[PDB]
């Protein structure tokens, strides 16, 4: 059929792609440079989609095919087509190459591909077993070049079990895997393992253990930008739930900055929602461009209403906002922070008063913030002066809030500190760029 | 030096953004005249940074040594 022949052609092109990736893996192991395995994994997400039964059937018929347990393991889980007319024997290894065992990296890549296909087919149980087998056989291996594919397979195994709605049978095993990766000095594998452990804790609400792990473990600096963004989001949630609001805001802004341009909509949605909540708690009204964006508009609409209520200062509006979308906030895992905002709303008003006025009288500030009595205003203002929200100094002798006089920052040292940080970053970037330089062997 | 480096950065912008691929290996050899790309480029960066670093270090050494 026309559709069938088109599918066969796409399968053949995918087979050519996998052959190219396996050749790259072999060249990487020969040259001991991750670059090639990194590119193979980079192409992996694209190949994850656009795969049917015959695709992987032909891949297993051509690759491997040594009568090994893999063929008797995945094939019983994946159907087999009839005698295809275009029986092109996809055999990159010919004669001696076929006899030689498949390279550990290449075999791991093929097992990862089959596991991804099982994921996309919702064969949760079969992917379970195939992932255990591949993980066990990769655990024995100790080649450095295998570590990146090991990290990818680790992440996909955690994902398969996450769809298994258990995500606890993995806790100890991923802890052990991450610890071994840390011992081995691996970077990508330990990065993915730490991110996945943090994700599991955040799912099951074990915040304290996650904070302990983040405090003790150290994330390698030379990690993937996407992995860094995921870790930043997880650490931002940990900090925000733990009352380190400023650090949470900074970390989540960094995570948003490091997001993959336009590749992951959902991660951006969640980061924006949590950042909006944290910023509202910290006393800053968030930017409207986020709410106006096309992809994030409908997702953040309840947060837009919440920000409206907070800025306007109408506690009743906040209550009706919670009534309509309270369950949505809960399902988003931000209900507790929203309640904290409900009881901290006065911080935004105090911050606005601090920005506007410089010597506001206590009675007038109490009137403006709809407080009942001036003494409550004094209490709230002092609490704000600690909370990093205001920089004033109450003069209780005459009861007026005297904001600190602004000073010429340039004549002070802060510009030197900012320039030092930026110059250090620039010099480090230059050193890193000239450091690799990928000079070929003559 | 900063103004002349701004002009030179304009020239470097023009040269790089062009990135003419009509045998780029030949392009880099048919425009070799000790010009914008790097010669009148980071040479000036080195001059500026050496002068500024030396001057600042001397100023701080004087602020410490002399009272």
């Amino acid at each position: 059929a026309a559709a069938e022949h088109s599918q066969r052609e796409l399968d053949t092109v995918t087979l050519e792609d996998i052959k190219e990736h396996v050749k790259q893996l072999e060249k990487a192991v020969s040259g001991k440079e991750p670059r090639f395995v990194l590119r193979a994994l980079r192409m992996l997400p694209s190949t994850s989609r656009r795969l049917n039964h015959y695709v992987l059937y032909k891949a297993v018929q051509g690759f491997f095919t040594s009568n090994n347990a893999t063929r008797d393991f995945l094939l019983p889980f994946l159907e087999e087509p009839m005698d295809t007319e275009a029986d092109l024997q996809f055999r990159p290894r010919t004669g001696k190459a076929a006899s030689t065992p498949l390279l550990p990296e290449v075999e791991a890549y093929l097992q990862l591909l089959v596991v991804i296909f099982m994921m996309n087919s919702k064969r949760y149980k079969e992917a379970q077993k195939i992932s255990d087998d591949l993980m066990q056989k990769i655990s024995t291996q100790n080649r450095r070049a295998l570590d990146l594919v090991a990290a990818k397979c680790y992440y996909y195994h955690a994902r398969v079990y996450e769809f298994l709605d258990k995500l606890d049978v993995v806790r100890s095993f991923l802890h052990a895997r991450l610890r071994t990766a840390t011992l081995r000095h691996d970077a990508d594998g330990q990065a993915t393992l730490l991110n996945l452990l943090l994700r599991n804790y955040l799912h099951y609400s074990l915040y304290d253990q996650a904070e302990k792990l983040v405090s003790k473990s150290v994330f390698p600096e030379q990690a993937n930008n996407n992995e860094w963004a995921r870790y930043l989001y997880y650490t931002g949630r940990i900090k925000a739930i733990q009352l380190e609001y400023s650090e949470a805001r900074r970390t989540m802004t960094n995570a948003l900055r490091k997001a993959p341009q336009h590749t992951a909509v959902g991660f951006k949605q969640t980061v924006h929602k949590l950042l909006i909540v944290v910023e509202l708690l910290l006393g800053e009204i968030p930017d409207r461009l986020q709410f106006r964006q096309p992809s994030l508009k409908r997702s953040l609409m309840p947060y837009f209403l919440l920000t409206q209520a907070v800025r306007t200062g109408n506690l009743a509006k906040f209550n009706q906002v919670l009534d309509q979308f309270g369950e949505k906030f809960q399902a988003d895992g931000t209900y507790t922070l929203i309640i904290r905002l409900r009881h901290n709303v006065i911080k935004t008003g105090v911050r606005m008063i601090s920005l506007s006025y410089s010597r506001i009288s206590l009675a007038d500030i109490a009137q403006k913030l709809q407080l009942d009595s001036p003494e409550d205003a004094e209490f709230i203002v002092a609490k704000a002066i600690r909370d990093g929200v205001i920089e004033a100094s109450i003069n209780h002798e005459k009861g007026y809030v005297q904001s600190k006089e602004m000073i010429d920052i340039y004549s002070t040292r802060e510009p030197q500190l900012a320039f030092h940080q930026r110059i250090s970053f620039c010099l480090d970037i230059h050193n890193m760029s000239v450091k690799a330089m990928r000079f070929p062997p003559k | 030096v900063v103004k002349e480096m701004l002009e030179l950065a304009k020239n470097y912008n023009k040269a790089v953004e062009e990135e003419d691929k009509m045998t780029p290996e030949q392009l880099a050899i048919k425009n070799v005249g000790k010009q914008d790309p790097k010669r009148h480029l980071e040479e000036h960066v080195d001059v500026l940074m050496t002068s500024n670093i030396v001057q600042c270090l001397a100023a701080m050494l004087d602020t410490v040594v002399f009272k």
Partner: peptide
């Protein structure tokens, strides 16, 4: 700081050029 930014940009451009040259040589190898 401006000099450091210029140096970093030049180094990054040189790294990009060298990487593309290496990739082109490898591709033309086979």
């Amino acid at each position: 700081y401006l000099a450091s930014l210029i140096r970093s940009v030049v180094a990054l451009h040189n790294l990009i050029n060298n990487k593309i040259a290496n990739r082109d040589a490898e591709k033309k190898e086979g």
